[PDB]
């Protein structure tokens, strides 16, 4: 995340971290046994035994006392996900459960995020804090970004025809604030500024052109657009 601040310790109990091979992604706990991430994170189809999910983390790849490390028993990419257009860029991770059907231990640091049913949105992740950075963030970063309409993101000098149904754009056209490499799968959560009654997961960090650059806002998978697919496969 470019142009963000350190996330408060209790402000992100839904963020999941995904470690395997030499890759890194994030995700969102949407049920005790289910994490929602980007499909392109699993583009090379890694074996589920190779994946490690960690919940409750403030610092990247850190073994903290409230941290919980879980294995992944299976995952499902949205069908017709294209590794060219990146339409339908979302996947579901099914965590390992015990004999009593319990996966994550819900706690003040580990909580599912509400799904969709004057709006402020925040993006969070451990990725690069600058485009082309040499190193992931240690502390989780958070940054406020606004929604950007379809026609403004589809402008030719912005993202043009690359914005497809089921995608969503957020950030500032002038630049400075964005997700970046290593943030993929992470959440874009929003809350209504006129009442501030519920934090809801509205986007999944997906792709961009650079990070935080002019006329190149971040592109997200539109969670509300795939609500029925998420409900059916969980």
């Amino acid at each position: 995340v470019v142009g963000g601040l350190v996330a408060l310790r209790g402000a992100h109990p839904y963020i999941a971290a995904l470690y395997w091979g030499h890759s890194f992604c994030a995700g969102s706990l949407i049920a005790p046994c289910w994490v929602l991430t980007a499909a392109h994170c699993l583009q090379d189809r890694p074996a589920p035994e190779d994946l490690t999910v960690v919940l409750g983390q403030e610092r990247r790849n850190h073994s903290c006392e409230p941290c919980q490390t879980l294995a992944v028993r299976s995952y499902r990419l949205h069908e017709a996900f294209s590794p060219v257009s990146y339409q339908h860029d979302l996947a579901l991770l099914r965590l390992q459960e015990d004999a009593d059907g319990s996966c994550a231990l819900l706690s003040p640091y580990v909580q599912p995020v509400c799904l969709p049913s004057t709006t402020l949105c925040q993006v969070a992740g451990w990725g690069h804090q600058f485009e082309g950075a040499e190193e992931y963030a240690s502390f989780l970063q958070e940054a406020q970004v606004p929604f950007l309409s379809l026609e403004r993101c589809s402008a030719p000098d912005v993202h043009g025809s690359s914005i497809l149904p089921g995608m969503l754009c957020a950030g500032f056209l002038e630049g400075g604030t964005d997700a970046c490499q290593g943030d993929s799968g992470g959440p874009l959560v929003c809350e209504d500024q006129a009442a501030e009654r519920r934090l809801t997961l509205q986007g999944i960090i997906s792709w961009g052109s650079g990070c935080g650059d002019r006329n190149k806002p971040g592109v997200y998978t539109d969670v509300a657009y795939y609500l029925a697919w998420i409900r059916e496969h969980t």
Binding site: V84, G127, E131, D183, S209
Partner: protein, 34 residues
């Protein structure tokens, strides 16, 4: 050269280790191209 570069964190040594329009940057991580 623009295009779609997904925001996965990934070590690389060739461009082919990177998804979409990303390339292997000088930092040996995948990132946007030219």
């Amino acid at each position: 050269d623009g295009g779609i570069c997904p925001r996965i964190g990934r070590l690389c040594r060739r461009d082919s280790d990177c998804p979409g329009a990303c390339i292997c940057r000088a930092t040996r991580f995948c990132g946007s191209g030219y």
